[PDB]
Amino acid sequence: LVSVYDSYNPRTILLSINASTHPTHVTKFHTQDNKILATASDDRVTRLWDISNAYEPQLELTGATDYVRTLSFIPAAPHLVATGSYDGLIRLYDTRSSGSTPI
Amino acid sequence: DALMVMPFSYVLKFLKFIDTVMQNKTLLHSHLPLICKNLFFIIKFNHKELVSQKNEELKLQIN
Amino acid sequence: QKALPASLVPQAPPVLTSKDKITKRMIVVLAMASLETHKIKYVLLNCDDHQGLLKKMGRDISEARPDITHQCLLTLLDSPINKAGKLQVYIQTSRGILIEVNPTVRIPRTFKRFSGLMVQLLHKLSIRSVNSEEKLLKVIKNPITDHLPTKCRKVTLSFDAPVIRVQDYIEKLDDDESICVFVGAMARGKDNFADEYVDEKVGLSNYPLSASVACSKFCHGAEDAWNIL
Amino acid sequence: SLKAGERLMEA
Amino acid sequence: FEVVEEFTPVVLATPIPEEVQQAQTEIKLFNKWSFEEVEVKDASLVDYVQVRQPIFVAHTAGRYANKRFRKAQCPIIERLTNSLMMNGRNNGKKLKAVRIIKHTLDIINVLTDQNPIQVVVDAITNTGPREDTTRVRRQAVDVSPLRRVNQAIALLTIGAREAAFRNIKTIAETLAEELINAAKGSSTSYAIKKKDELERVAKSNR
Amino acid sequence: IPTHAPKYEENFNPDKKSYDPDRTRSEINKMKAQLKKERKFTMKEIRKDAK
Amino acid sequence: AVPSVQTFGKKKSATAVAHVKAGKGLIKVNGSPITLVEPEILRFKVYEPLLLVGLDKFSNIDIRVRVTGGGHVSQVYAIRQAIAKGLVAYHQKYVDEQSKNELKKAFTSYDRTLLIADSRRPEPK
Amino acid sequence: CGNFGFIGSSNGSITIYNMQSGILRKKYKLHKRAVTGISLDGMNRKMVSCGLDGIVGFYDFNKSTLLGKLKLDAPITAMVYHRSSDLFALALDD
Amino acid sequence: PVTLAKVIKVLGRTGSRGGVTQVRVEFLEDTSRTIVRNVKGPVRENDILVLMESEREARRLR
RNA sequence: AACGAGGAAUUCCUAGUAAGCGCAAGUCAUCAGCUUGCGUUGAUUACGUCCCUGCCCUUCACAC
C-alpha cells in the first residue's frame, strides 16, 4: 500500500493506493509534473499513478526480470523515466509513447 | 387561455379552418365577431413565428 | 512473465451486503412472496395446513403458498454463485414487507422449520446467528431501489416477453453495473408486480418455468458468464 | 375530461 | 499614463498581516481562491449558479427563503455549505460545515492544480439531471434549472456523506473525491451515476 | 463464503415474553411486573374512591 | 476637542459600540487588536469593511469597539456593522461628503447589512 | 457638481482636489509639457485635457482610465468646453 | 446533441398534474421556432431548458 | 440474556421555521414521573396547482 500524507500533518491521509500485493520499495513524485506519482514494487512493474485517478495506473512500465528498487526522473525530460533492477540493467522508458517497453 | 395552449402547428390548421369558412358566407356572417376575436388573438400571440415562415401558400391564405 | 500474487492462500470472498453498492453482483428479488402470520400460537399461513382460517380472512387459498419462496431460497443460496459471494437475495412479501437475506445464511431444509423461522422474523424484525455475530435475516425499509446498487440493470421474468440467452445477456452487460432479477414466486398472476421499478422484462424459455427453475436457470447463466464455476 | 383548447385541438 | 491614488505608504498602528493587505487588493474565497476566472460552462445553469460576487467566507446570514427564486442569488459555496449540514446530529452547526468546505477546497487544489471553485462549479454543472420522470407507470418531463442546481447539490453532498459514513475516510476527503470525479464526469462519482440512471429511465419512458 | 445457522425459538409466541436463561432472574422480573400493575391499579382506585 | 463620532451595531442580542476619532490607524475590539477577534474562521467577516474601502482611509483615525451580548456570530456581525457605520459617520462629520457617498456606495454594493440593521421580525401568515 | 477642483501644472501633471476638505484625491500624468486646459462634462464622466505638447487627452473620470489620445498639428493654447453640446474648441498655435 | 430553449410563456389553466408546469419555449438556435414542453421543477419566464429531444410535443399529463 | 439508530402503517411540518444546546423560574387552575419561560447555533425543500382527495361559494359609465 502506498500512502500519501500531508507533510507536517500526520493525522490526515489524502490518498491511499494499493499499488500491488508485493512490497512497494520505491515511491517518488515526478519532479516536473506534480499530479503523477511513480511506484516500483517487487512485482517488477513500475506503475505510474495519478493523484487524481487512484483506481488504475496511468502507465505500467514492465520488462524487468528482477526486483526494481531504483527509479529516477531525468531533469528537462519529463517524458523519460529511468529504472534500475537487480538484473544489472538500467532501463529507460518514454511515457509520451505507449510505454511498457524500454527504449 | 385555450388558444395560447395551442401549438403553432395547430395555428396553421386554425388558419386553414378560417380560410375554408370564408367561402361559406352564411357561416361567416353568423359568427363574424367570434371569428375575428379568435383570429386576431392567434395572430397577435405568435406573430413572430408566423412572419418567419417562408411558405408561399400561407401568404396566399392570409391575403 | 507476470509475477504471481504474493500470497496464494485461499481467501474467503467478501460477504456482499446492502452497505456495499459498487461491487458487481447478481441480485434476485422474489417478488409477491406470500408470507403471513396469524395466531391459532402464531403460524405462517399455508395453503394446505390452514384453509378454514384463510377463508375467515377471505384471502384466496390459491395465493397462500410460502413453499415456493422456500424452494427458491434453497436453490438460490445453494447455487455456486452464492458460494462465490456474488449474489444477494431480497424478498418482497405480498403484504409490502421487504426482507434482506444475508448470503451467509443457512435456512433449514425442512419446510416445517422454515415456517417457524419466518414467524420469528416477521415479528422480531431480525434473526441472529447461533453464535451471535451477525444478523442473517433483516427486514428493511421500502422502496427496494434505495438498497439496490447505484448502477444496476433491472429485469423481470415474463412468459410473454421475448426469450433470451441469459449467458449472452449478462456478457453484453457492462462490468461496473450489476443485474437484478425480479422473480415472481407467486403461483399464478399478472407479471406486473415490479413494473414500477423495472425497465425491461425478458423471458428465459418458450415453455413456462417454475420460480425455482427460473431463478436457478438465471444463476447458471451468470456463473458461466463470470466463470464462477 | 378534456379541457378547452385540448377539445379544440381534437376538433 | 499613470493615475496615482495614494501618495504616502499606509502603515497602521495596529499591525495587520501582509496577507490581509493582499486581500485588500482583491476579494478571494478564504483569501486563497479568486472568483475572477470562474465561469459556468453550461449556458442554462447561468443565472442560477451564482459566482460573480466574491466573498471571503461562506457565512452570510442572508435572507434567501423569503421569495420563490432568491436561492439563485445565494453564492453557490454557501449553498453547498448549507446542504452539508443535515441528519439531525449536524443540524445548526454551520461553522463546522464552513471548516469542512475549507479543507475540501484545500484538498481539491492539492490533488488538482485547477482552481477549486471552478471544480465545484463544474461538478454542479455536470451532475444536474437534464430530464426526469413523473408518476402517471412513468412519463418523461424536462427539469427546471433551479431544480437542476438543487438536485446537483443534494446528490453531491449525499454521496459524499454516504461514502464516509462508516469508513476510514473523513467527510472532507470524500467530498473532495466526489467533486473531482463529478467535474471530470467519470462514472466513479455517485452523483454522476444517479444522474445517468435518472436520464436513462426518462429516455425509456419518453 | 462462511456459513452460519439462524437462531430462532421453535413455536415462537410474541405475546409470551422472551425465555430467560436464569429462572430467578425471570421470576423476580415476574414479581416486579406483578407489583407494578397492582400498585398502579390500587392507586387508581383509592383516588377514585377519595374523589 | 478631538473630533470623534459614536455608532452602534446590533444583531440579535449582540450590541457593539464603535468610537471613531482622529488618530493613527489604531483599531481595537474590546481592548484588543482587531486581528485577535474570534472565531478565526469568521475573522475575515469583521475585515469586510476595511478591505472594501481600503486601509488607507483608516490610517488617519482610531476605532475602538466594545461588544456585549449575543453569541460569537452575532457579535461578529455587530462589530462589522458598527465599524462601517462609524467610518461613514466620521466621513460625514469631519471629511468631505463626496468620500462619504463613495463609502456608502461601496458598502451598499457589497452588503447592505453593514449599514442597515438586519432583524428578522416575525410576519404572521 | 462643485465637489472637485482640477489643477494643471506647467510640468504636465493634473492634480484633483476636493473643494470641501481641500484634500488631494487623484493625480493624472499624461502630458509632458504644460497643461493649458482642463474640462469635465456635465455628467462628471469624461474628462478632457490639452497641453503645449499638442496632444488632447480623453479620460474617464469615474473609472480613471485613458479613453484615447489625439495629437494636433500645433501646440494648444486654450480650451473652452460646452457642456450642453459636448463640443470644445481649442485655440491652436497655428 | 441537446438543444437549449428559453421559456417565453408559462401556460395557465392547462389542467396539468400537480408539480408539472406546461410552458412554451423558444429555441436559442432558431428564435422563430417555438415548442410546448412539460417541466417538473419551479419554472418562470426567460430561463433555459435543455431539451434532449426537440420533436415530441407536450400533451396534458393529467 | 439484550442490543448495533429501529418494519408495515400512521402523524406533523414553510424562516429566525425544522433540528441541536444549555440557563433560570415554579407565579391561587395544571405541573416536579414534570411545566413554563429565556437566550445560543440554525438549514433542506415548496411558496405553484386545482390533476387527485375533501370543505366551500355562485348560476351608475366604458368594455364584456
Cell of I9: 410563456
Output the CA torsion C146→C152→C158→C164 (10° steps): -170
CA F41, F44, F47, F48 dihedral sign is: negative
Q: Shortest CA distance to A65 belongs to which of A44, A95, A82?
A: A44
Distance between CA atoms of residues A85 and E153, nearest Å: 49
Residues composing chain C: 229
Local structure of residue G58 (DSSP, 8 states): G
3+ Cβ–Cβ pairs closer than 8 Å linking A and G: no
Say yes or no: Cβ of C139 under 7 A from any atom of strand J. yes
Say yes or no: Cβ of G72 under 7 A from any atom of strand J. yes
Sequence-separated (6 or more) residues with CB below 8 Å from residue B33:
none
Local structure of residue A82 (DSSP, 8 states): E
Could you list the residue range(s) of the whole structural domain that residue E62 is in? Answer: 7-206
I9 within 8 A of I54, measured Cβ to Cβ = no
CA E84, E86, E87, E90 dihedral sign is: positive
CA E145, E147, E149, E155 dihedral sign is: negative
Distance between CA atoms of residues E134 and G102, nearest Å: 52
Nearest nucleotide, C1' to the C-alpha of C96? J8
H31 within 8 A of H55, measured Cβ to Cβ = yes
Say yes or no: Cβ of E64 under 7 A from any atom of strand J. yes
- Give the β-pairing of C126-129 and C98-101: unpaired
Which chain A residues contact residue E174 at CB under 8 A?
Answer: none
Distance between CA atoms of residues I62 and D6, nearest Å: 12
E151 within 8 A of E128, measured Cβ to Cβ = yes
Pick out residues 9-38 of chain G having their CB under 7 A from any atom of nucleic acid strand J: 12-14
Cell of C55: 377463508
The residues facing G65 across adjacent strands are G18, G29
Mutation for C interface: E155, E186, E187, most C CBs within 10 A: E187
Nearest nucleotide, C1' to the C-alpha of E59? J42
Q: Shortest CA distance to C105 belongs to which of C93, C123, C96, C117?
A: C117
Q: Do I34 and B8 touch (CB under 8 A)?
A: yes
Q: Shortest CA distance to E140 belongs to which of E129, E149, E131, E152?
A: E131
Say yes or no: Cβ of E96 under 7 A from any atom of strand J. no
Q: What is the DSSP string of chain C?
A: -PPPPS--S--PPPPP-TT--SS--EEEEEETB---EEE--EEE--TTT-SHHHHHHT--STT---HHHHHHHHHHHHSHHHHTT-EEEEEEBTTS-EEEE-TTB---SSHHHHHHHHHHHHHHSEEEESSSSSEEEEEEPSPHHHHS-SSEEEEEE-SSSPB--HHHHHHHS-SS-EEEEEEE-SSS--S-TTTTT-SEEEBS-SS---HHHHHHHHHHHHHHHHT--
Say yes or no: Cβ of G73 under 7 A from any atom of strand J. yes
Say yes or no: Cβ of G7 under 7 A from any atom of strand J. no
Sequence-separated (6 or more) residues with CB below 8 Å from residue C82:
C76, C103, F1
- Residue type at E4? V
Q: Do E193 and C151 touch (CB under 8 A)?
A: yes
H39 within 8 A of H47, measured Cβ to Cβ = yes
Q: Provide the terminal-to-terminal Cα distance of chain E, rounded to the nearest Å.
A: 63
> Which residue intervals of chain E are DSSP H helices?
18-25, 76-84, 94-111, 116-126, 145-163, 171-184, 190-204
Please return the burial class of D1, using the count of CB atoms within 10 Å of its CB with bins 0-12, 13-18 and 19+: exposed
Cα nearest neighbour of B1 on chain D = D5
Distance between CA atoms of residues H3 and H11, nearest Å: 25
E1 in a structural domain:
no
Mapped onto helix, strand or coil, the DSSP state of residue B43 is helix
Q: What is the DSSP string of A6-56?
A: ETTEEEEEEEEE---SS-EEEEEE-SS-SSEEEEEETTS-EEEEESS--SS
Q: Is C203 marked within a binding site?
A: no
Helix (H) or strand (E) holding A5: strand A2-6
Sequence-separated (6 or more) residues with CB below 8 Å from residue C71:
C211, C212
Is the bond into C143 cis (omega within 30 degrees of 0)? yes
Local structure of residue E90 (DSSP, 8 states): T
Distance between CA atoms of residues H8 and H38, nearest Å: 7
Cell of E1: 499614463
Sequence-separated (6 or more) residues with CB below 8 Å from residue E125:
E40, E41, E42, E45, E49, E152
Residues composing chain G: 125
| E194: nearest CB among C150, C176, C195 | C150
Distance between CA atoms of residues C148 and C143, nearest Å: 10
The residues facing E34 across adjacent strands are E28
Distance between CA atoms of residues H16 and H29, nearest Å: 11
Pick out residues 151-170 of chain E having their CB under 7 A from any atom of nucleic acid strand J: 153-154
Q: Is C162 marked within a binding site?
A: no
Mapped onto helix, strand or coil, the DSSP state of residue A97 is coil
Which chain I residues contact residue B12 at CB under 8 A?
Answer: none
Q: Is E200 on the interface with I (CB under 8 A)?
A: no
Q: Is C1 on the interface with A (CB under 8 A)?
A: yes
Distance between CA atoms of residues C144 and C146, nearest Å: 6
- Residue type at A99? G
Pick out residues 2-61 of chain I having their CB under 7 A from any atom of nucleic acid strand J: 12-19, 21, 41-42
Q: Is H25 on the interface with E (CB under 8 A)?
A: yes
E2 in a structural domain:
no
Which residue is listed with cell 454543472? E125
- Residue type at H89? A
Chain J nucleotides reached by a protein CB under 7 Å = 1-4, 6-9, 14-20, 39-52
* CA–C1' E142–J17 (A): 31
Mapped onto helix, strand or coil, the DSSP state of residue E68 is coil
Angle between helices E94-111 and E171-184 (to 10 degrees): 50
Q: What is the DSSP string of H19-87?
A: TTT--EEEEEE--SS-EEEEEE-TTS-EEEEEETTSEEEEEETTTTEEEEEEE-SS-EEEEEEETTTTE
Q: Shortest CA distance to C209 belongs to which of C174, C178, C163, C170?
A: C163
Which chain C residues contact residue E204 at CB under 8 A?
Answer: 199
Distance between CA atoms of residues E114 and I52, nearest Å: 30
Which chain B residues contact residue D6 at CB under 8 A?
Answer: 5
Q: Is E18 on the interface with H (CB under 8 A)?
A: no
Q: Shortest CA distance to E38 belongs to which of E122, E161, E124, E143?
A: E122
Distance between CA atoms of residues C35 and C97, nearest Å: 9
Give phi and psi for A89, each to the nearest 5.
Answer: -105, 135
Give phi and psi for C140, each to the nearest 5.
Answer: -125, 170
Q: What is the DSSP string of I12-32?
A: -S--PPTT-EEEEEEESS-SS
Cell of H16: 484633483
Q: Shortest CA distance to I9 belongs to which of C89, A23, B8, G84?
A: B8
Distance between CA atoms of residues A14 and C110, nearest Å: 53
- Residue type at A84? G
Which residue is listed with cell 529516477? A72
Q: After which residues is chain F broken (C to N over 2.5 A)?
A: none
Q: Do E1 and H64 touch (CB under 8 A)?
A: no
Nearest nucleotide, C1' to the C-alpha of I16? J51
By what method was this entry solved?
cryo-EM
- Number of structural domains (chain E) is 1
Distant-in-sequence contacts of G94-102, Cβ < 8 A, 24+ apart: G94/G3, G94/G5, G94/G22, G95/H21, G95/H23, G96/H3, G96/H18, G96/H20, G96/H21, G96/H23, G97/H3, G97/H20, G98/H3, G98/H4, G98/H18, G98/H20, G99/G57, G99/H18
CA distances from E4 to B61, H2, H68 (A): 70, 22, 19
Angle at the Cα of A62 from the Cα atoms of A56 and A63, rounded to 5 degrees: 170
Q: How far is E197 from chain C (nearest CA, A)?
A: 7
| E1: nearest CB among H24, H26, H66 | H66
CB interface of F with C, residues 1-51, below 8 Å: 1-14
The residues facing C37 across adjacent strands are C44
Mapped onto helix, strand or coil, the DSSP state of residue E80 is helix
* CA–C1' H47–J15 (A): 50
Output the CA torsion I28→I29→I32→I33 (10° steps): -90
C99 within 8 A of C139, measured Cβ to Cβ = yes
Any idea which architecture I1-62 has in CATH? Answer: Beta Barrel (2.40)
CATH of the domain at E79: 1.10.455.10
Local structure of residue E62 (DSSP, 8 states): -
* CA–C1' C213–J3 (A): 39
Distance between CA atoms of residues G114 and G10, nearest Å: 10
Pick out residues 22-51 of chain F having their CB under 7 A from any atom of nucleic acid strand J: none
SS3 content of chain B, % helix, strand, coil (to 5): 85, 0, 15
C59 within 8 A of C47, measured Cβ to Cβ = no
Sequence-separated (6 or more) residues with CB below 8 Å from residue H68:
H58
Q: Do C129 and F6 touch (CB under 8 A)?
A: yes
D8 within 8 A of B34, measured Cβ to Cβ = no
Separation of CA H19 from chain center: 17
Angle at the Cα of F26 from the Cα atoms of F20 and F31, rounded to 5 degrees: 160
Distance between CA atoms of residues A14 and A29, nearest Å: 15
* CA–C1' E170–J40 (A): 28
C68 within 8 A of C211, measured Cβ to Cβ = yes
Domains in chain G and their CATH numbers? Answer: 1-125 (3.30.230.10)
E134 in a structural domain:
yes
Which residue is listed with cell 431539451? I51
Q: Is E39 on the interface with I (CB under 8 A)?
A: no
Q: Is E204 on the interface with C (CB under 8 A)?
A: yes
* CA–C1' E100–J16 (A): 24
E153 within 8 A of E86, measured Cβ to Cβ = no
Cell of C219: 444463476
Residues composing chain D: 11
* CA–C1' C135–J3 (A): 12
E200 in a structural domain:
yes
